Amino acid sequence: EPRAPVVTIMGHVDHGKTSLLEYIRSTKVASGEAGGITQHIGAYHVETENGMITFLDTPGHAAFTSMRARGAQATDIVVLVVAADDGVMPQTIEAIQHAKAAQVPVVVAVNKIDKPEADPDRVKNELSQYGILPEEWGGESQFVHVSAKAGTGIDELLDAILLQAEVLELKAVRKGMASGAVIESFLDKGRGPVATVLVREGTLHKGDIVLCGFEYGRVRAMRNELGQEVLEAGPSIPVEILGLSGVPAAGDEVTVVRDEKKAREVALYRQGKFREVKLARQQKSKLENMFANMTEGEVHEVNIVLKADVQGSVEAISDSLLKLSTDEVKVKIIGSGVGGITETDATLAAASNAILVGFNVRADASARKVIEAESLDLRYYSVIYNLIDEVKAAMSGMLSPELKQQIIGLAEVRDVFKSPKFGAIAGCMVTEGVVKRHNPIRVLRDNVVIYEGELESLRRFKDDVNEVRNGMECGIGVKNYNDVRTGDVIEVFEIIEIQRT
Amino acid sequence: AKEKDTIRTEGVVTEALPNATFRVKLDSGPEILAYISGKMRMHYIRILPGDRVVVEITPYDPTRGRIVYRK
RNA sequence: GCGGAUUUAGCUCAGUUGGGAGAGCGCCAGACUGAAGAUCUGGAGGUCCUGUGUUCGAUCCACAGAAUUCGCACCA
């Protein structure tokens, strides 16, 4: 009759959420203090009246708000992981805000007590230390100085959750309709399209009708009476692949079998409403206003790709990244090979789509060979940024070195001996300045400053040059007459306005 | 049904490209690919590489336009 | 620079008996045609490069000058 006191590991990033869980798991594998316990995809057990204590392996990118329920939080007791050297941070106060609103009794785990200067560490013992005192009481919370890697302070932490877990909420409830999310939309060997689920609160029955979210819209499906609808992982005894169960409870992982669930999406609710139709219209409606005035310019957008082991985790991180205002591209299921090339196709235009940003998914052997190129980055935790910085360095690296030509400045050129005339392709040596194309040519200051011609095209050996300086000696093409001679000193005409620079 | 998000902004002609296509520099900003209208091609009208023309631009494609008025 | 050629109607050119200023085209009109076109006809349309001189008289000859063009000469 007594169920599991649902607990979640809340706090700031890199404070010791995953590492505290790795020690409660290391003493679970070890004999004496525990033993042969059942494996769940992210949960453990119950108080002195049954097993151990259920720690929910928090949604992939510290979401916690997904672990909600019908009215409040899906968690009974909660454990807040804070750092000893840092103190209370902005994500720790966001954790206290979701703790007082859902009315869930919290315990504070002040992690990394092995990090402060000159502190002797006794492995796996009980601790007695103080620190962050202005934020504790009996009306507030009980603080315990723990070390996730060493294991000290864990004996009083599991005891502090026990003095807080003696409630009636482990029996009575579960009555309301099942609120949760799926895990994956895959194909089984003994059946067709199967769907594993994570249920936050409530009970699913063997003949329960559940509304699910597809690519198009809202379509419901009855849980198959013929065959096995509720399929849990068979207990430690070898028989058939899975086993039939009747009614799963709050905090259970179960593989469901229904009818048409082929185009059923990733990140859907176990009460459902999803579409790609709205997100395509919401993006097109804001892009139609941005392209009605934009009959002219450019700049532009985002990326990010989410994929998880659980959808109670995908839906969680999507809602948490939409809180940080970082938009998403793909939330589908598959690896790479054909995804690594579509990533390299969109890097040519704007490098803002240059990354195949993976998470909890396995990278293929055929994919590893196409990731060998550096132009594309591969992430297995997931974010962006580096993207809009790559295209910024692309256009800014080509606009600055392209300045050299124009402006009628001073330049003198002397025509060499025995060089042809018609459309005057004559060999000429530059004396001073930079003689450019389109620059006007004049006669000597000894005579009158009359218009002799203008430079057509300059040619140094083989190369067609625009600017000739110092004394390069090239084949100058110019529109001249008998006004030009061989060995004459020509000066470029500074128009009286451009003369005074 | 026809959408009314079509603009009638002016512009000056720049380059004379083949098959009745021009470069047309807009008085608003940059330049579009602007072709001559089916109304103007039937009434002939020879456009020189430097005339003032009104462009019928569609919001779906910024690079494409259409010459409506003659001079 | 020297030497030569050329300089007449809007254009293109003829015009040495020193005495008439002219042709084609064009332009305008007429005739005609339905009409327009062509064609035919008719008209207007000149500092004959400019000045001076020669002569009875000068587009026509002499002298001087200017302009065009060609050859030649000259050229850091």
Question: Domain holding A144: CATH number?
Answer: 3.40.50.300
Distance (Å) of CA A159 to CA A135, A136, A153, A431: 20, 17, 10, 93
For A292, residues 6+ apart whose C-beta sits below 8 A from its C-beta are B5, B59
Total count of domains within chain A: 4
Q: Which residues pair with A458 in a beta bridge?
A: A465
- CA dist A96 and A102 (Å) reads 10
- A93: helix, strand or coil: helix
Angle, CA of A147, A151 and A157, to the nearest 5° = 75
For residue A486, give the nucleotide whose C1' atom is nearest its CA: C76
Q: Which two tokens stand for residue A253?
A: 């992982």
Half-sphere exposure at residue A153, Cβ-oriented, CA atoms within 13 angstroms = 23
- CA dist A432 and B61 (Å) reads 51
- Taking a C-beta distance cutoff of 8 angstroms, is the pair B31, B60 a contact? no
- Taking a C-beta distance cutoff of 8 angstroms, is the pair A419, A426 a contact? yes
Give the closest of A288, A292, A296 to B30, CB-based.
A296
Tell me, yes or no, if B62 comes closer than 8 A to chain A by beta carbon: yes
**Residue A288 maps to a domain:** no
Half-sphere exposure at residue A7, Cβ-oriented, CA atoms within 13 angstroms = 29
Length of chain A (residues): 501
DSSP conformation class of A260: S
Measured from the Cβ of residue A218, the count of other Cβ atoms closer than 10 Å reads 12
Task: Kindly state whether residues A15 and A145 are assigned to the same domain.
Answer: yes
- Taking a C-beta distance cutoff of 8 angstroms, is the pair A69, A201 a contact? yes
- CA dist A215 and A420 (Å) reads 77
Q: What is the DSSP string of A221-246?
A: EE--TTTTSEEEEPPSS-SSSEEE-S
Q: Which two tokens stand for residue B49?
A: 């590489």
Torsion of CA A191, A197, A202, A203, to 10 degrees: 20
Please classify residue A156 by burial: count the beta carbons closer than 10 Å to its beta carbon, then call 0-12 exposed, 13-18 middle and 19+ buried.
middle
Of A149, A99, A148, A109, which is closest to residue A129 (Cα–Cα)? A109
Task: Kindly state whether residues A162 and A194 are assigned to the same domain.
Answer: no
- Taking a C-beta distance cutoff of 8 angstroms, is the pair A407, A498 a contact? yes
- Taking a C-beta distance cutoff of 8 angstroms, is the pair A256, A196 a contact? yes
- CA dist A117 and A100 (Å) reads 34
Measured from the Cβ of residue A344, the count of other Cβ atoms closer than 10 Å reads 15
What residue ranges define each of the domains in chain B, with the CATH number in brackets? 1-71 (2.40.50.140)
**A297: which chain B residues are within 8 Å (Cβ-Cβ)?**
29
Task: Kindly state whether residues A42 and A160 are assigned to the same domain.
Answer: yes
Task: Kindly state whether residues A77 and A96 are assigned to the same domain.
Answer: yes
- Taking a C-beta distance cutoff of 8 angstroms, is the pair A310, A183 a contact? yes
- Taking a C-beta distance cutoff of 8 angstroms, is the pair A146, A111 a contact? yes
For an interface test with B, the pick among A290, A294, A295 (most B C-beta atoms closer than 10 Å) comes out as: A295
Domain that holds residue A240: 179-257
**Residue A285 maps to a domain:** no
Task: Kindly state whether residues A196 and A162 are assigned to the same domain.
Answer: no
**Residue A243 maps to a domain:** yes
What amino acid occupies position A87? G
- B67: helix, strand or coil: strand
What amino acid occupies position A463? D
Q: Is the dihedral of CA A51, A52, A57, A58 positive or negative?
A: positive
Rg (alpha carbons) of chain B, rounded to whole number: 11
Task: Kindly state whether residues A99 and A22 are assigned to the same domain.
Answer: yes
Task: Kindly state whether residues A69 and A100 are assigned to the same domain.
Answer: yes
- CA dist A37 and A368 (Å) reads 37
Q: What is the DSSP string of A330-387?
A: B-----SSSSSSHHHHSTTT-GGG--EEE-SSPPPHHHHTTS-STTS-EEES---STT
- CA dist A432 and A107 (Å) reads 83
- CA dist A35 and A225 (Å) reads 36
Q: Which residues pair with B35 in a beta bridge?
A: B21, B66
Q: What's the maximum distance between 2 C-alpha atoms anywhere in chain B?
A: 36
CATH number at residue A475: 2.40.30.10
What distance in Å separates residue A498's CA from the closest CA in chain B? Answer: 27
Task: Kindly state whether residues A14 and A153 are assigned to the same domain.
Answer: yes
Task: Kindly state whether residues A137 and A22 are assigned to the same domain.
Answer: yes
What H or E segment, with its residue span, contains residue A131? none
- Taking a C-beta distance cutoff of 8 angstroms, is the pair A78, A104 a contact? yes
| β strands within A132-259, DSSP E | 142-145, 179-187, 193-201, 209-213, 218-222, 230-233, 242-244, 252-257
Chain A span 428-447 residues with beta carbon within 7 Å of strand C? 444
The reply to whether residue A295 touches residue B5, judged by beta carbons under 8 angstroms, is no
Distance (Å) of CA A246 to CA A43, A208, A211, A254: 20, 11, 20, 11
| Distance measured from the CA of protein residue A9 to the C1' of nucleotide C16, in angstroms | 130
Task: Kindly state whether residues A17 and A140 are assigned to the same domain.
Answer: yes
Q: Which two tokens stand for residue A107?
A: 């315990």
**Residue A406 maps to a domain:** no
Length of chain B (residues): 71
Instruction: Give pairs for A450-453: CB < 8 Å, separation 24+.
Output: A450/A483, A451/A493, A452/A480, A452/A481, A452/A483, A452/A484, A452/A490, A453/A424, A453/A478, A453/A479, A453/A480, A453/A481, A453/A484
- A433: helix, strand or coil: strand
Task: Kindly state whether residues A121 and A72 are assigned to the same domain.
Answer: yes
Distance (Å) of CA A24 to CA A49, A147, A366, A371: 19, 12, 37, 37
Q: Which residues pair with A264 in a beta bridge?
A: A214
- Taking a C-beta distance cutoff of 8 angstroms, is the pair A475, A425 a contact? yes
- Taking a C-beta distance cutoff of 8 angstroms, is the pair A142, A105 a contact? no
**Residue A267 maps to a domain:** no
What amino acid occupies position A251? G
**Residue A484 maps to a domain:** yes
- CA dist A495 and A453 (Å) reads 15
The reply to whether residue B59 touches residue A291, judged by beta carbons under 8 angstroms, is yes
**B29: which chain A residues are within 8 Å (Cβ-Cβ)?**
296-297
CATH number at residue A355: 3.40.50.10050
- CA dist A41 and A252 (Å) reads 9
For residue A488, give the nucleotide whose C1' atom is nearest its CA: C76
**Residue A273 maps to a domain:** no
**Residue A276 maps to a domain:** no
DSSP conformation class of A186: E
What H or E segment, with its residue span, contains residue A54? none
Half-sphere exposure at residue A197, Cβ-oriented, CA atoms within 13 angstroms = 32
Q: Characterize A436-472 residue by residue with b for buried, 16 or more Cβ atoms within 10 angstroms of its Cβ, and e for exposed.
A: bbebebbbeeeeeeeebbebeebeeeeeebeebeeee
Tell which residues of chain B come right before a gap with C–N over 2.5 A.
none
Task: Kindly state whether residues A353 and A313 are assigned to the same domain.
Answer: yes
- CA dist B71 and B67 (Å) reads 10
Q: Residue A166, by phi and psi: left (phi above 0), alpha (psi -120 to 50) or beta? A: beta
Chain centroid, CA A15 distance in Å = 20
Of A42, A304, A281, which is closest to residue A181 (Cα–Cα)? A42
Method for this entry = cryo-EM
